[PDB]
């Protein structure tokens, strides 16, 4: 009970939620540019510098983030029935209907997940802009010179 406060006074544990999209999508050019941004090579350096030999049998540069495309993922995973068939049989009818429904749900899920991530990044940026404006506004509001300050002694030339 003592530790439930850190998590909201709620007892027990849920399973960790897992991501619909396991890797960053290609349309997130923001994070693509972030990863391709120049890599620090100094006091806070992230990798090897010029003139230093990385250990034999090791890759000097870190691997490449596998950016995925939603359209490519859908194409590889779920494919339309390119060959149409005469579904006269009962089992054929049932299984075709099931496949249709499953494909629709999966494609909808992937599309909505990508949309959600994009909206999330945009909303985060908008919130950051609002907070920066609020910071500047509050700082200048406190910086405004109020007459009541004259009743505080000041050794300015001192």
């Amino acid at each position: 009970g003592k530790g439930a406060a850190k998590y909201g006074f709620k007892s027990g544990v849920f399973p960790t939620t897992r991501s619909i999209l396991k890797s960053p999508t290609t349309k997130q050019t923001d994070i693509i540019n972030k990863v391709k941004s120049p890599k620090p090579k100094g006091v806070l350096g992230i990798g090897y510098a010029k003139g230093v030999k990385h250990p034999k049998g090791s890759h000097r540069l870190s691997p490449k983030v596998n950016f995925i495309d939603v359209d490519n993922l859908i194409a590889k995973t779920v494919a339309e029935p390119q060959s149409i068939k005469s579904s006269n049989g009962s089992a054929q009818k049932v299984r075709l209907q099931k496949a249709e429904l499953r494909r629709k749900f999966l494609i909808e899920a992937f599309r909505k997940e990508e949309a959600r991530l994009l909206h999330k990044h945009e909303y985060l940026q908008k919130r950051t802009k609002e907070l920066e404006k609020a910071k500047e506004l509050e700082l200048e509001k406190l910086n405004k010179e109020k007459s009541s300050d004259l009743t505080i002694m000041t050794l300015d030339k001192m």
């Binding site: 009970g1 027990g12 544990v13 849920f14 939620t17 009541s148 009743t151 505080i152």
Partner: protein, 319 residues
């Protein structure tokens, strides 16, 4: 240093003396008899002033100190009586000037030892009917009615609901003569609420005291900075008390400015049913990570704080 002590009356009373062996009486019992007076064949104590009930809208509460253990008076002429050596009642030799004039606060105070407790005022049926008509027929807002009569918004809405029940009982003649007699008796037993009387009027500016405010905080500013309620509220990260009270005024169920549209954001799917079915599933949208019975949740069933609830039928259940 403590000891057991029988709760003898603080006021003087005739104690026991030489009692015939087969009487086995106690000073407590003799004090009881002196307080109650003689018991008539009807099983009544007409002598005791508190035996009956008032009919002049003046509460009749005990005044031990004021009366100094003299609860016996004449039933009809309402004159004081006191026990005599010979054992029969008689008016006191000297009048008690404490009882001749009592303050209104002590008149309403029920228990001598507690000055804070005070009886509440009974609303007249005329006032109840007027408030009913003004809230339903005239459409006047609950805030307006509360401001008009001095009553609190919960009380006025409560009386609206109660008078609705009373009207239904009247339509169906459920009220009876015995209930009417109780009505009259307990109406005459309590004082009436007078809206014209300011000291009678309730206060309409009471707000709950929050935890953040309960704590004491002290701020050091130069001897010329103005500092007001808005600044204090900002420092405490709270909204002004005026905003808090204005919200309270509008919170009323039937009061103005009520809004509870939040739930309108969620999705509900009432499933279909066919002939012969006994129930209907009502699915509702949920959010992963915030739904479902949790794993490893504390089992309080064997502890002193196990939760208990009541279902719609009123049945006791373990929640």
């Amino acid at each position: 240093f403590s000891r057991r002590r029988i709760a003898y009356p603080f006021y003087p009373f005739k104690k026991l003396g030489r009692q015939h062996p087969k009487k086995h009486d106690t000073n407590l019992k003799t004090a009881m008899r002196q307080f109650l007076g003689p018991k008539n064949y009807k099983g009544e104590y007409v002598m005791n002033k508190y035996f009956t009930v008032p009919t002049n809208h003046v509460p009749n509460y005990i005044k031990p100190d004021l009366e100094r253990g003299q609860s016996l008076e004449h039933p009809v002429t309402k004159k004081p009586l006191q026990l005599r050596y010979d054992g029969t009642l008689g008016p006191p030799p000297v009048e008690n000037k404490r009882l001749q004039n009592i303050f209104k606060d002590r008149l309403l105070q029920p228990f001598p030892s507690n000055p804070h407790c005070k009886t509440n005022y009974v609303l007249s049926p005329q006032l109840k009917q007027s408030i009913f008509e003004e809230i339903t027929v005239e459409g006047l807002s609950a805030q307006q009615v509360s401001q008009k009569y001095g009553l609190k918004i919960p009380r006025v809405e409560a009386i609206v609901k109660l008078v609705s029940v009373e009207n239904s009982w009247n339509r169906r003649n459920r009220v009876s003569s015995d209930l009417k007699t109780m009505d009259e008796t307990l109406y005459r037993m309590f004082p009436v609420f007078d809206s014209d009387a300011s000291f009678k009027r309730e206060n309409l500016s009471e707000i709950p005291v929050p935890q953040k405010t309960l704590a004491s905080r002290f701020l050091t500013i130069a001897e010329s900075e103005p500092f007001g309620p808005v600044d204090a509220a900002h420092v405490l990260e709270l909204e002004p008390a005026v905003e808090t009270l204005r919200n309270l005024s509008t919170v009323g169920e039937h009061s103005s400015g009520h809004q509870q549209s939040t739930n309108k954001n969620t999705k509900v799917i009432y499933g279909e049913l066919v002939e012969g079915e006994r129930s209907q599933y009502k699915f509702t949208n949920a959010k992963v990570g915030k739904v479902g019975y949790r794993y490893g949740s504390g089992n309080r069933d064997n502890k002193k704080d196990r939760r208990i609830g009541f279902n719609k039928l009123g049945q006791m259940v373990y929640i």
